Design a binder for this molecule. Structure first.
Ligand SMILES: Nc1ncnc2c1ncn2[C@@H]1O[C@H](COP(=O)(O)OP(=O)(O)O)[C@@H](O)[C@H]1O
Ligand SMILES: Nc1ncnc2c1ncn2[C@@H]1O[C@H](COP(=O)(O)OP(=O)(O)O)[C@@H](O)[C@H]1O
Ligand SMILES: Nc1ncnc2c1ncn2[C@@H]1O[C@H](COP(=O)(O)OP(=O)(O)O)[C@@H](O)[C@H]1O
Lengths: 130, 50, 333, 374, 374, 373, 47
């Protein structure tokens, strides 16, 4: 099975490396952008995957970007309140014409890199600073 | 409906059953007359077109 | 405000919390010992019950009466639902098909009425068995009626079987004596057989060369009996069939039984069906894997929950029976 | 040797039906249930016997636990099958199986070891001189009397559809769906809970099965029947339990067979029987479909609910093109059709060439069943 | 600011809890018992205000009969429910039911009249503005903080196991076993009568229940425990009675909870709780089984036996495949966690859509609970 | 420099995407759309209606899984729009309004399919340019030779085309509908024989994984059947996701043998070797000698271990003796249909091939037949 | 030998006669449609 081994070999190496380098530089750019936009309020993001997990950072980012008021985030340490906090930001995005695919609150909560990077990219592209 | 009689409902069903049988009989005679007329018309048209 | 929350709690509770965190329950101690004792007083008395009853009664009598703030009167303080009524369907038409057929069905009994009710298509009105015997033949068979209630099948009574007349001590004594005219030992469904007595049977059958079949079905046997039988099977060369169905043997005991199979080549049928608890799939895997080792056993009665071990056990039984067929064929020609 | 008449035995999941060849009806019909002692205490009524087989087990439900040797058309317990076959041969037909040939039935898509173990067990423990294994849905078409059509069988363990055109079966179009009377019985227990009644043990299972066999019917329109049942109590009927109290099922009499048309009630994502039959027709060639639409044949004991024929015809007419003509052939004796065609199959003169001899088994082992049978 | 939120009322089979939403602990904890004068009219009709409720009922154990209005999760007597509910609203919580929404719990597979009757009592007697009915097992999964796992809940009347994967419930795999702590109380009385201490009436019921709560434990190995108890007396403990007499339990400490695992002692044809959990897991799909192995959650007051978790882990690992891992979550506060689940679920901002307001009840009646809830 | 175009390969089983000029795709994910089955009792969870791509494969138990593409034809278009949206915005994080798009199509299929893709990509995604190319032409590009016959096999369609010196022969193009999904269904039907039951859509993924791991093409079929019947050395063990252990055994090589004998599935068509030989024989006499030595395999379905030796043996049996047969099977052939596409968008003259936005606006969605082959 | 069995026989005979009547009617209807389908084109060809 040398040809199958070489196919798995190419799959393990080139696709993964070419995706990883793009993902790394994209997340490094996105961290700079969200830190520049969140610096007006007393907030800072040190890790893109972990700080956006909880949900307060995202709702504050939508607060500052929209310039317009959002409902009270629910207070609580468990997972369910975190799901609520992500879901409210997702609903706010659902109102202002932004179209999202494969987006669930538990996807952001669990910490999928692809979906959080796509959400930030969609925020940059389709949402209006206004 | 709380008040009903089994005899009456059975009797209505018998009425509907004979109506169905009669309807199918006019259907059969209906269609036999139709097919004979169409066959004769087709034959006459074929002869004169030939 | 963690410090303020901890200060809001009692200081004795804080010391108790420190002690409990140092203790962390009692995972090291066994299950029995981890509970605390209630009181330090020694047991006294043969438990005279009437003193308990009288003490409880006077305790109930000399109790200060809690007075509730609001008495209960069963007052309904909410709006009643008052369900809506429908105008329904007030229609009335007479069909009047035939003066002959009016009087024909006017005086018919309900039992014969249901036949013409079923032949016209009101299957919902009566039971299905009634509906089908109505359509079975061109005669009135229906006796019950559409309104009547349905009754279950009675089947047939079974005569009582005579209880087990096989005595215990004389049978064991004859087994120990190597009796030539004792070949079948039946112990099915016998009240209160002692476990050491069953073990004594197990070592008694070690040296018996005249009993071919054994059965202890429904004897409430347990794991020591299984261990003793597993020890016995290696020595014995005459026993054909062992039956241990309907017992309290655990999975480990059954594992000990199947582990004796490679050593002996005299057992052909073993039944372990209907045990109190499921054996588990690991025990099943061991059973089938090292039952594939044995080549003598032909019949094995067990219902496997998994599909893999069941398939492999069926294949092993097929192989053993096919070996019997092949040696017969080779002996013929 | 015309005195030697073969035995026709159908081993269904719920009931076993045995009889002599060349007869219109089976002689013995009895459920295949093995009863074993409970663990709460010793029994009252039996001594040296280890278990009860047949109607004797069915009568003594209160002291026995009941087990089915056939699970979804698969023999899980082979010793239980030996007990069932021994009871059939010695206690019902009262004949020695050494002198008679045996004909047996089987579901289409089975483990391949089923036929091999069946043949080996028969030949070794009963010494029959000849035997044969046939497939149930071909026997149904033999009983119906035509050589072209689709057979949709629904027994107590499995449902299967097969098409036949002029006696050639199409193996790539055979569909097997796991939906039978046992799942309907379990769903009936689950939908009888909310009225108040509770059924747990195996005797309760037999009671619920007896209720289902006599009280359930298939609604023509589900929503219209639901509205009718919510409107008034016209559909309600009463049943008498063996204890003495009377229950009233009411609405759920037509909710139990609806799982045959909507499997999502049971949680499975499969399709209904109508969709299965339509898919089985679409798997065949374009030319023969016109025959297969005209000769849909129902069978099995599960299709004994009234109103099933009109509902299935309505569903298939919804699915099929408008030009095509659809009729459903539901014989009134269909519950025993799988047996009846077997009595035909053992009567044919060509079939005497098709038996599996004792000698042929002796050289070829139990693998002769694959080469000799379909 | 919605009239200090709703009230969470966990009305268990043997003991009721009540409190405010958003609080970790219930405000009121008291048994669900109605005590009546037994047979006499002595001492100027002693036993006045004949319904004694809660702690006052257990105070006068000798002169009263104690009746449980909830048996096996089903309301036998409705007047006693509304008396208990009046006691909760007015005598202990001291809040008006007119301005506070009410959250209620119930068993999963219960007769359908219970929901309608609870809705009728809430809206017609105490005229609450909004009300909702949930399931104890879902509340336990809420309290555990996980959105994936299998939940066992065993109270004084019912045991039920439900699986939930990613917030999606599987209704076909929900089980209900009718083996609870009351049966263990009766078995404890049965084995205590053999030793010599005969306990008959309701005061004896409370005493035996107290003995069971204070001195019972689940043995890891039953036969080893039997050998240890027969060999020595180190496992023996002493319990003093309220009057002063002291008795010894001894062999009866571990035989009482063993009926949870072997129902043959109780005289019931049923499987153990571990078999119920394993069968509920096998009834799910292939892929989501592994997570259900790794997120087993225990709940209810019955699970406060010492050593139940390790024993049931040993049993499950005996049944489960050896490749993956088995763990059991047993919080020390689990007896109250059902109520805690309500304190979470009424606290959510999205739950305000799910309230059954009075305006819809005034148009739909008590049947709206079938559409609004579950 | 100009903006690099996006190479997007829409297969029946997997979807691949990347940038032109790269040697490997940057995003590979299954083309599956799943929808919830049961009911949700937890309030406050996610309310997403459709799982797509790898996220649908992550949670199989509570989903019914569907394929928007079957047999090389798009049957559901909303699911295709979801697939393309997840490919563009999430897997690559690119703006489609500034990138030309290259697409991949089977040779023979319904015509209207092409129009629909064009009508989608100019309207919903507003691309400035797009193009559609046949799979096997791109495979021949990635092979590195101008002259050869290309046999491609995926999950939806098998097709053989001959090309001589860059000239294609349209009458010799052959298409067969036996592909990977048919092999998966046949493996399910043949695994029923051992007692194992798989029925749901989630279990089809399990069966597909078993087929990918444990199937090989036997060089001789009857000899392999005799060997597998005589001994049990051919058996292998697989572990189910719930810890069960199954044994395949004789079913390892019977499933791929269906590629060469289609009578196992009830199809009366010929095998892949017969299809290749017939496609060679339809060509002219002169160009056959170059076509016999330049046979190229492609697609994931041709990744069974031992397919090349069997194909060479059968074609050598059919072909005359004086000609020599060479089967070219590159080790990375699964992505060849992508790789040649990444070559094709990097050429200088391909900038003269694009269907511009203005041309579509002028001549409607039927322009794709005039430009694309 | 009584009136009720005669009633059952009469309604059963009527029912099966009715069923045979719709079967014959629908078959004849489809044949009629085919014949008209053929004849109309002949008239157009004459014109
Ligand atoms: N009169 C009846 N009405 C409805 N269902 C019935 C009736 N009689 C039997 N059944 C169903 O048919 C099943 C028995 O089917 P059976 O013919 O034994 O299947 P098999 O093909 O396995 O032999 C029973 O479990 C029962 O549910
Ligand atoms: N400390 C304890 N140790 C052992 N068992 C206990 C303990 N406390 C309570 N129990 C058992 O729990 C039961 C009470 O369960 P409970 O939580 O009231 O059920 P419900 O869910 O109906 O409220 C009692 O019958 C008792 O046997
Ligand atoms: N290593 C392998 N061995 C055997 N077959 C494979 C292997 N990998 C993939 N396959 C088969 O190839 C199919 C995937 O082909 P793919 O290249 O995705 O087709 P397309 O992309 O054209 O739709 C799978 O369904 C599988 O059956």
């Amino acid at each position: 099975d040398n040809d199958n081994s070489s196919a798995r070999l190419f799959e393990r190496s080139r696709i993964k490396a070419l995706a990883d380098e793009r993902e790394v530089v994209q997340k490094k750019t996105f961290t700079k952008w969200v830190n520049s936009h969140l610096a007006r309020v007393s907030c800072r993001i040190t890790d893109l995957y972990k700080d956006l997990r909880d949900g307060r950072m995202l709702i504050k980012l939508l607060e500052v970007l929209s310039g317009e008021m959002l409902p009270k985030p629910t207070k609580g340490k468990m997972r369910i309140h975190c799901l609520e906090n992500v879901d409210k930001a997702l609903q706010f995005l659902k109102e202002q014409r932004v179209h999202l695919e494969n987006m669930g609150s538990h996807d952001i909560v669990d910490g999928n890199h692809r979906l959080v990077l796509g959400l930030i990219w969609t925020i940059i592209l389709r949402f209006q600073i206004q | 409906m709380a008040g009903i009689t089994t005899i009456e409902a059975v009797k209505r069903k018998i009425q509907v059953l004979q109506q169905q049988a009669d309807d199918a009989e006019e259907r059969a005679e209906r269609l036999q007359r139709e097919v004979e007329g169409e066959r004769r018309a087709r034959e006459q048209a074929e002869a004169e077109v030939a | 405000d963690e410090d303020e929350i901890l200060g809001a709690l009692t200081e004795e509770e804080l010391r108790t919390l420190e002690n409990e965190l140092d203790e962390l329950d009692n995972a090291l101690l066994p299950a029995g010992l981890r509970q605390k004792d209630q009181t330090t007083k020694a047991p006294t008395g043969p438990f005279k019950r009437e003193e308990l009853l009288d003490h409880l009664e006077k305790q109930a009598k000399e109790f200060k009466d809690r007075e509730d703030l609001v008495p209960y009167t069963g007052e309904k303080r909410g709006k009643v639902w008052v369900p809506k009524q429908k105008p329904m369907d007030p229609v009335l038409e007479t069909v009047t098909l035939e003066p002959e057929l009016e009087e024909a069905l006017a005086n018919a009994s309900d039992a014969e009425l249901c036949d013409i009710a079923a032949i016209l298509g009101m299957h919902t009105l009566m039971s299905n068995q009634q509906y089908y015997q109505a359509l079975g033949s061109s005669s009135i068979v229906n006796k019950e009626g559409l309104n009547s209630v349905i009754k279950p099948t009675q089947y047939k009574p079974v005569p009582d079987e005579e209880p087990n007349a096989t005595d215990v001590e004389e049978t064991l004594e004859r087994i120990k004596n190597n009796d030539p005219k004792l070949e079948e030992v039946n112990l099915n469904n016998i009240r209160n057989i002692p476990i050491p007595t069953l073990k004594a049977y197990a070592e008694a059958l070690k040296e018996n060369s005249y009993v071919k079949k054994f059965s202890i079905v429904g004897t409430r046997s347990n794991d020591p009996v299984a261990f003793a039988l597993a020890e016995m099977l290696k020595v014995n060369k005459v026993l054909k069939t062992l039956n241990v169905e309907s017992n309290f043997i655990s999975g480990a005991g059954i594992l000990r039984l199947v582990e004796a199979l490679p050593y002996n080549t005299s057992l052909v049928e073993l039944k372990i069906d209907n045990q109190s608890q499921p054996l588990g799939n690991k025990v099943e895997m061991e059973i089938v894997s090292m039952l594939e080792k044995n080549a003598t056993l032909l019949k094995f009665g067990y219902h496997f929950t998994q599909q893999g071990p069941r398939l492999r056990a069926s294949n092993a039984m097929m192989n053993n029976n096919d070996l019997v067929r092949k040696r017969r064929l080779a002996d013929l020609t | 040797d015309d005195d030697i008449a073969a035995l026709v035995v159908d081993n269904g999941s719920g009931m076993c039906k045995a009889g002599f060849a060349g007869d219109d009806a089976p002689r013995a019909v009895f459920p295949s249930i093995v009863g074993r002692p409970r663990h709460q205490g010793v029994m009252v009524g039996m001594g040296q016997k280890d278990s009860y087989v047949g109607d004797e087990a069915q009568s003594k439900r209160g002291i026995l636990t009941l087990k089915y040797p056939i699970e979804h058309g698969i023999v899980t317990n082979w010793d239980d099958m030996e007990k069932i076959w021994h009871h059939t041969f010695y206690n019902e037909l009262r004949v020695a199986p050494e002198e008679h040939p045996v004909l047996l039935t089987e579901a289409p898509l089975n483990p391949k070891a089923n036929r091999e173990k069946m043949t080996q067990i028969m030949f070794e423990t009963f010494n029959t001189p000849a035997m044969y294994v046939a497939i149930q849905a071909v026997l149904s078409l033999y009983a119906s009397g035509r050589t072209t059509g689709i057979v949709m069988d629904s027994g107590d363990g499995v449902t299967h559809t097969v098409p036949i055109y002029e006696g050639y079966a199409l193996p790539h179009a055979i569909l097997r769906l796991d939906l039978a009377g046992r799942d309907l019985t379990d769903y009936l227990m689950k939908i009888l809970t909310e009225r108040g009644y509770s059924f747990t043990t195996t005797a309760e299972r037999e009671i619920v099965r007896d209720i289902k066999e006599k009280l359930c019917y298939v609604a023509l329109d589900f929503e219209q029947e639901m509205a009718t049942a919510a409107s008034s109590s016209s559909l309600e009927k009463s049943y008498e339990l063996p204890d003495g109290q009377v229950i009233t099922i009411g609405n759920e009499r037509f909710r139990c067979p609806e799982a045959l048309f909507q499997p999502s009630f049971l949680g499975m994502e499969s399709c209904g029987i109508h969709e299965t039959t339509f898919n089985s027709i679409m798997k065949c060639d374009v030319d023969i479909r016109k025959d297969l639409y005209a000769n849909t044949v129902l069978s099995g004991g599960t299709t004994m609910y009234p109103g099933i024929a009109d509902r299935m015809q309505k569903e298939i007419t919804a699915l099929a093109p408008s030009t095509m003509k659809i009729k459903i052939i539901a014989p009134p004796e269909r519950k025993y059709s799988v047996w009846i065609g077997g009595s035909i199959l053992a009567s044919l003169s060509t079939f005497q060439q098709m038996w599996i001899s004792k000698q042929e088994y002796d050289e070829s082992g139990p693998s002769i069943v694959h080469r000799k049978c379909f």
